[PDB]
Curated annotation (Swiss-Prot):
The N-terminal may interact with various proteins as a chaperone to assist in the folding and insertion of proteins into the outer membrane. The C-terminal region may serve as the link between BamA, BamC and BamE. It comes from the Bacteria. Keywords: Cell outer membrane, Lipoprotein, Membrane, Palmitate, Signal. HAMAP family: OM_assembly_BamD. The keyword Signal applies. Part of the outer membrane protein assembly complex (Bam), which is involved in assembly and insertion of beta-barrel proteins into the outer membrane. Constitutes, with BamA, the core component of the assembly machinery. Probably involved in transient protein interactions. Efficient substrate folding and insertion into the outer membrane requires all 5 subunits. The gene is bamD. This is Outer membrane protein assembly factor BamD. The lineage of its organism: Bacteria, Pseudomonadati, Pseudomonadota, Gammaproteobacteria, Enterobacterales.
Length: 210
């Protein structure tokens, strides 16, 4: 304690204290220990593990900018580290944490993160809870898009409607909100007198309506 005037002990000892403080749930004191490590022994024997720990502690203490800072640093220096999957997962969580504090760029980021994890490391411990979250994100992101499509319908901006829904079909297919947006697409086409295009959409609606 209590600042990076932590006693001059060798690394394994200070790490041991940090482990303790982490298990006690004492995030603020853990961060003191781990920064003393990061600053004194930047190439230490636990130097990578310290960063993984600092990503955790910063997050639990709600120092989110600090967490993403340490996440991105890490991903850049260690693109193939055996715990890269843990890091991606924490990137997801941190962007969800930020989205939680209407355009949701932070939820978009999270979605992009959990997608990389899931597609890139299908065998990770984290894949399971990451995909459960993607499901949550897909739906909220799609609901936001749909409400923009709903706005443009209101204003008769037919082409804007089509463009929105095309994005929905690409990024968030297999979603309820996307299925509810399809009729907005069909309508926007009929309004532009483009009935051929409208019939094609009507095909898709009919199909997932059985």
């Amino acid at each position: 304690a209590s600042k990076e005037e932590v006693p001059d002990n060798p690394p394994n000892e200070i790490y041991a204290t940090a482990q303790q403080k982490l298990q006690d749930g004492n995030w603020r004191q853990a961060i003191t220990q781990l920064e003393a490590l990061d600053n004194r022994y930047p190439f230490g024997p636990y130097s990578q593990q310290v960063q993984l720990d600092l990503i955790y502690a910063y997050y639990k203490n709600a120092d989110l900018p600090l967490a993403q800072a340490a996440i991105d640093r890490f991903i850049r220096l260690n693109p193939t580290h055996p715990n890269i999957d843990y890091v991606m997962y924490m990137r997801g969580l941190t962007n969800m944490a930020l989205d939680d504090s209407r355009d949701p760029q932070h939820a978009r980021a999270a979605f992009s993160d959990f997608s990389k994890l899931v597609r890139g490391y299908p065998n990770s411990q984290y894949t399971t809870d990451a995909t459960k979250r993607l499901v949550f994100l897909k739906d909220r992101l799609a609901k936001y898009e749909y409400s923009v499509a709903e706005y443009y319908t209101e204003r008769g901006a037919w082409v804007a409607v089509v463009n929105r829904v095309e994005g929905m079909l690409r990024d968030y297919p297999d979603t309820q909100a996307t299925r509810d947006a399809l009729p907005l697409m069909e309508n926007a086409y009929r309004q532009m007198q483009m009935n051929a295009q409208a019939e094609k959409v009507a095909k898709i609606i009919a199909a997932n309506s059985s």
